A and B are shown apart, each in its own frame.
Chain A
Amino acid sequence: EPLRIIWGTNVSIQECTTNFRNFLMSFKYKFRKILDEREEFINNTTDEELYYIKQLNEMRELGTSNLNLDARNLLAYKQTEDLYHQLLNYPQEVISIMDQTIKDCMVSLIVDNNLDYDLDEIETKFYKVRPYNVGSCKGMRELNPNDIDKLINLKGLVLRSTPVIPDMKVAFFKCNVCDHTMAVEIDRGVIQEPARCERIDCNEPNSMSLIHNRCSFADKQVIKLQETPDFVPDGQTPHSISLCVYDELVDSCRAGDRIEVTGTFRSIPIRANSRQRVLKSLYKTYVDVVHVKKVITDQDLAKIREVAAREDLYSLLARSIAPSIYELEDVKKGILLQLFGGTNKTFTKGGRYRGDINILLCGDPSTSKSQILQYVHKITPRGVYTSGKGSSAVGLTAYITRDVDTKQLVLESGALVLSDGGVCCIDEFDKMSDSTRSVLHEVMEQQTISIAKAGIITTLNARSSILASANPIGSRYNPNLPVTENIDLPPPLLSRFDLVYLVLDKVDEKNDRELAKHLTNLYDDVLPVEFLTMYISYAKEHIHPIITEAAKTELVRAYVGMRKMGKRITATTRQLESMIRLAEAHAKMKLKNVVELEDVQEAVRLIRSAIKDY
């Protein structure tokens, strides 16, 4: 009988197919547990139930096709140890056999179970297998020629990924004489164009045309991978390897992401020049990836509501924001209110009123100010870290650049644009370019960035809050001089921040002693950072407070009283919009849809304390 054998070996394809089918049909995780010397963790329900049968059933239910296989499970089964070794040694043929067997079992399940599921849909699908955990991960520097055409594991950091490349699968040809069409498959990238028309009646030789847009294509993408920092032996430039991903694996990993990839180590000849079949002696190595790994519910809503119902929610959130910062309750409260933010109003006849809150953190350099910004970044769902006059940062304004990679013109958005809807923390506000200051003024005034350079006229949304930090001109902030002189910023730009905080490191025996105790000990419940971020996201997404009559009366009375204090002008209309925003944010914090007198009272107090510093 014809007997099919993998080229260069003595392994029968029929044996591999039957072994894999038996393994898939009958396998339980208890075998893996006993293999891993974890037999005493075996339960009675999950470990005694078929695993891959359930996986196939769930795949059919969800309509997916790809199957994730743990190579160790093959060792966990007596029959498939040889199959595991063959997969490690001859991956291409074994993988093709596994795909066909997976399709066969998928159809056989429906055939045997006489289910009502449509069979034609199944027959027209393509099935694949994605093995992983095939042994210890090697290094990019340990790949010798002996590893060619063998399955390897490699950990690294993604550096770049080319756009989707169309890869040809089936070629479509048309007859120029009889309008007859035929599809010819492609093998090793070689199109098998007919010599002549296949029609008996029309035997016209050499009259076949390839219709490019009517052919079948596939997705391909090339990714550059760099070895992990620990793999560098001395500290030289880390090496890199090229990866290829097809179909579903495309767009499965972005730049800067640490991933683990399983694939086949392959070598391909490189043509000397474009005119000729001549090849270079040296071969190029790459990896044909087959598997990639990266290294709100009802219960969540119930937990959020329970937390909101707590009486001391404000203090709890303030403490959770900055556990490591000592005795800055007011600053933490202001930061919390900024994080929650006010209500964005989209007015017909009026225009746009911003609901963001801006806070300036100025004072002595000894006190902790950058750590607060880092915490705010860690908490805010959206935001970017930047320092004025900083080359490392991407930038505060949109700019037109050249894509070195592609030699293409690309419009890149700045830090403020990327922070749309979030909090943008600027570490060093004091030192900043004039241009950057003008951009900041425009963003805080119009909330949009406009660029009219390089033949492009566009406006980018920048609806983001700002939390900047500043330092005095000298080694300390002089109380005698006014804040404007000390901070060294234009009065206009300094008058746009809703809350201005002057954290000063006055020399006090008690305060110094307590700070020393806190710092040395570093060598009231607190919420996890993840839960706080989720709470902030939910509050900002769902709750929208509205002002009531009592709130209106309280706001009017408070503004009138503040104005009557001072001729010197104690407060301006900006001090009213700031109070409105702060009250709305506080109402947001309590998950309330109505602003009440308590929120207005809290707002007047936070605004007044900053004014008193001013």
Chain B
Amino acid sequence: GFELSKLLQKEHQMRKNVIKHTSARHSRFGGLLSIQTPDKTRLTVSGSQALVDEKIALQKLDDSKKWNKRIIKKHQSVAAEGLPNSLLNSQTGKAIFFTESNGKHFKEFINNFIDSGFNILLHSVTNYFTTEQDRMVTLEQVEYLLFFAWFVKYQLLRSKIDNSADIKQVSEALKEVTFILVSSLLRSAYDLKNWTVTHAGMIAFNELLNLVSRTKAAQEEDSTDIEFIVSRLFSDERIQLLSNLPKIGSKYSLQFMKSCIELTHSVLKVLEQYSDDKTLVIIEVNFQKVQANYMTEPVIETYINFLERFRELEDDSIKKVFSFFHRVFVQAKEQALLFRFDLIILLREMLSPDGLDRMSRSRKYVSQFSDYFLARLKKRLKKSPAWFVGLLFPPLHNSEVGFYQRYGE
């Protein structure tokens, strides 16, 4: 009942925001508006809201347009590869509605399995599969990776909630045999252009990085043997791969994008934490070099694309996206990247009364970022009038002027 009341209130706020777009009188009342452009030409719009408001007038002008630019989406049927429906293609937010008793039974079963034999099952499976890697079909790779990722993440969540049950039940993920198996699977999937196995390996690697971060948080002296693992896993080739993932993410499904984003977040988190804590040797790790590696037009594009779908995401995805944006804008000072129009339009959509609920921390992040971005954009525009034109177009790649554009000096 409490959740139902909260949802009803949310719908009430949405309806209230919708009300401003509806006319009190009936449709056939017949009010005609004339709006004057900066040049002396008058455009005609219909509707009471048009007369009473200007933003509504321009929105109607836009909306009334008939011509649509073609959008081509690269859709792959999961049944084609023989895989079942899973987290890879299931829409984000799709929730299995358990009953209380059934949920309790399922949680008890999973907890007992994780405390009894997850370690042994993972060890046996990893041995059998690394002994017979080449015979793997796509289904087995996806299956192994998804099982590993799901159970590791569930144990992490339960450890967070309950102080008793702890990481030592899923400690077998840390061991190097499983780690190298997962890394080889992901790298081969990448190389052969098998995007579904790529996605599964992405998820598994994200869970592994979160796990290793928790283990380091546990004890440093006991985590020297895990500093070894961190050094092994952040190999230059792997760095390159991880960096490349985001750049390609934009082409594929939403879920791909989200996994890319999350893995990026985890990678940067571990990199920064382990650079601050101590020195890293793979070849010493230069966190700034990696960071820089992460700063290019495809990455940003990817991010933008993912953020466009903000009415279906939770607050965590928005928080990660804007953490990345903060890294870009402030820490990296690569501001030219973000001086685009996709971001401006999307931010207007986010901050509009109809876009995001006022009572939300996501709106707080968006408002802070928008304030900073608008301040810096105003300063740049005051400096260089050319940037008004510039905004419209991708960055120039000219030796002469490129620097000037990018940094203003």
Binding site for B on A (CB under 8 A): 2-8, 13, 17, 92-93, 95-97, 99-100, 120, 123-124, 126-128, 167-170, 183, 185-189, 192, 195-196, 200-201, 203, 216, 218, 220, 246, 288
B182 beta carbon closer than 8 Å to chain A: no
* A99 in contact with B54 (CB, 8 Å): no
| A200 partner residues in chain B, CB cutoff 8 A | 254, 308-309
Q: Mark B54-70, 1 if CB is under 8 A from A, else 0.
A: 10011000010000100
CA distance A185 to B19 in the complex (A): 11
**How far apart are B45's CB and chain A's nearest CB, in angstroms?**
9
* A187 in contact with B47 (CB, 8 Å): yes
Which of the listed residues A3, A95, A96, A100 has the most CB atoms from chain B within 10 Å of its own CB? A96
Q: Mark B16-52, 1 if CB is under 8 A from A, else 0.
A: 1011011111111111111111000010101110011
Given the interface pairs A4-B57, A201-B254, the reply to whether A188 lies near B27 with Cβ below 8 Å is yes
| B24 partner residues in chain A, CB cutoff 8 A | 96, 99, 126-128
Interface size class of B (residues with CB under 8 A): 35 or more
B283 beta carbon closer than 8 Å to chain A: no
Closest chain A residue, CB of each to CB of B17: A123
* A5 in contact with B309 (CB, 8 Å): no
Residues B138-187 near A (CB distance < 8 A): none
* A203 in contact with B71 (CB, 8 Å): yes
**How far apart are A152's CB and chain B's nearest CB, in angstroms?**
16
* B32 in contact with A203 (CB, 8 Å): no
Residues B278-318 near A (CB distance < 8 A): 308-309
CA distance A380 to B342 in the complex (A): 78
* A189 in contact with B32 (CB, 8 Å): no
* A6 in contact with B34 (CB, 8 Å): yes
| B361 partner residues in chain A, CB cutoff 8 A | none
Closest chain B residue, CB of each to CB of A65: B24
- Add 18 more A-B contacts to A92-B29, A188-B30 (CB < 8 A): A2-B36, A6-B32, A7-B44, A13-B33, A93-B32, A99-B25, A123-B16, A124-B19, A126-B24, A127-B24, A128-B25, A169-B26, A192-B63, A200-B254, A201-B309, A216-B22, A220-B26, A246-B25
CA distance A4 to B54 in the complex (A): 8
* A5 in contact with B46 (CB, 8 Å): no
**How far apart are B305's CB and chain A's nearest CB, in angstroms?**
9
The 10 closest A-B pairs by CB, nearest first: A7-B32, A96-B48, A126-B24, A100-B52, A3-B36, A7-B34, A5-B34, A186-B27, A92-B31, A93-B31
**How far apart are B362's CB and chain A's nearest CB, in angstroms?**
19
**How far apart are B69's CB and chain A's nearest CB, in angstroms?**
12
| B254 partner residues in chain A, CB cutoff 8 A | 200-201
Closest chain A residue, CB of each to CB of B50: A4
* A96 in contact with B34 (CB, 8 Å): no
| A7 partner residues in chain B, CB cutoff 8 A | 32-34, 44
Given the interface pairs A96-B52, A200-B309, the reply to whether A4 lies near B19 with Cβ below 8 Å is no
CA distance A2 to B19 in the complex (A): 24
Given the interface pairs A97-B52, A169-B27, A200-B309, the reply to whether A4 lies near B33 with Cβ below 8 Å is yes
B397 beta carbon closer than 8 Å to chain A: no
Q: Mark B247-274, 1 if CB is under 8 A from A, else 0.
A: 0000001100000000000000000000
CA distance A203 to B70 in the complex (A): 11
**How far apart are A58's CB and chain B's nearest CB, in angstroms?**
20
B73 beta carbon closer than 8 Å to chain A: yes
B104 beta carbon closer than 8 Å to chain A: no
17 contacts between A and B (CB under 8 A): A4-B33, A4-B54, A6-B51, A92-B31, A99-B25, A124-B15, A168-B27, A169-B23, A170-B22, A186-B27, A187-B27, A189-B27, A200-B254, A200-B308, A201-B253, A216-B22, A218-B26
Which of the listed residues B18, B29, B63 has the most CB atoms from chain A within 10 Å of its own CB? B29
* A96 in contact with B31 (CB, 8 Å): yes
Given the interface pairs A7-B32, A203-B73, the reply to whether A97 lies near B51 with Cβ below 8 Å is yes
Closest chain B residue, CB of each to CB of A9: B34
**How far apart are A194's CB and chain B's nearest CB, in angstroms?**
10
Given the interface pairs A96-B52, A187-B46, A187-B47, the reply to whether A4 lies near B28 with Cβ below 8 Å is no
* B16 in contact with A120 (CB, 8 Å): yes
| Contact partner, B25, options A5, A96, A123, A185, Cβ 8 Å | A96
CA distance A23 to B286 in the complex (A): 70
| B15 partner residues in chain A, CB cutoff 8 A | 124
Closest chain B residue, CB of each to CB of A127: B24
* B68 in contact with A2 (CB, 8 Å): no
**How far apart are B67's CB and chain A's nearest CB, in angstroms?**
11
* B18 in contact with A183 (CB, 8 Å): yes
| Contact partner, A185, options B21, B33, B36, B68, Cβ 8 Å | B21
Given the interface pairs A6-B34, A7-B32, the reply to whether A96 lies near B23 with Cβ below 8 Å is yes
CA distance A216 to B375 in the complex (A): 43
| B31 partner residues in chain A, CB cutoff 8 A | 92-93, 96
Which of the listed residues B30, B42, B73 has the most CB atoms from chain A within 10 Å of its own CB? B30
**How far apart are B65's CB and chain A's nearest CB, in angstroms?**
11
CA distance A93 to B16 in the complex (A): 24
Closest chain A residue, CB of each to CB of B255: A201
| A3 partner residues in chain B, CB cutoff 8 A | 35-36
**How far apart are A288's CB and chain B's nearest CB, in angstroms?**
8
| B18 partner residues in chain A, CB cutoff 8 A | 183
| A186 partner residues in chain B, CB cutoff 8 A | 27
* A92 in contact with B30 (CB, 8 Å): yes
CA distance A104 to B223 in the complex (A): 64
**How far apart are B24's CB and chain A's nearest CB, in angstroms?**
4
| A187 partner residues in chain B, CB cutoff 8 A | 27, 46-47
* B29 in contact with A96 (CB, 8 Å): yes
CA distance A167 to B27 in the complex (A): 9
Which of the listed residues A4, A13, A100 has the most CB atoms from chain B within 10 Å of its own CB? A4
**How far apart are A103's CB and chain B's nearest CB, in angstroms?**
8
CA distance A404 to B19 in the complex (A): 42
| A201 partner residues in chain B, CB cutoff 8 A | 91, 253-254, 309
CA distance A218 to B27 in the complex (A): 10
Given the interface pairs A5-B42, A100-B48, the reply to whether A189 lies near B308 with Cβ below 8 Å is no
* A95 in contact with B25 (CB, 8 Å): yes
CA distance A170 to B22 in the complex (A): 8
| Contact partner, B51, options A93, A123, A188, Cβ 8 Å | A93
| A185 partner residues in chain B, CB cutoff 8 A | 21-23, 47
| B52 partner residues in chain A, CB cutoff 8 A | 13, 17, 96-97, 100
| B91 partner residues in chain A, CB cutoff 8 A | 201
CA distance A128 to B23 in the complex (A): 11
**How far apart are A270's CB and chain B's nearest CB, in angstroms?**
15
Closest chain B residue, CB of each to CB of A205: B68
* B19 in contact with A123 (CB, 8 Å): yes
CA distance A126 to B20 in the complex (A): 10
CA distance A196 to B68 in the complex (A): 10
| A126 partner residues in chain B, CB cutoff 8 A | 24
CA distance A456 to B216 in the complex (A): 87
CA distance A176 to B43 in the complex (A): 36
| B27 partner residues in chain A, CB cutoff 8 A | 167-169, 186-189
**How far apart are B144's CB and chain A's nearest CB, in angstroms?**
28
CA distance A185 to B71 in the complex (A): 25
| B16 partner residues in chain A, CB cutoff 8 A | 120, 123-124
Which of the listed residues B22, B31, B73, B309 has the most CB atoms from chain A within 10 Å of its own CB? B31
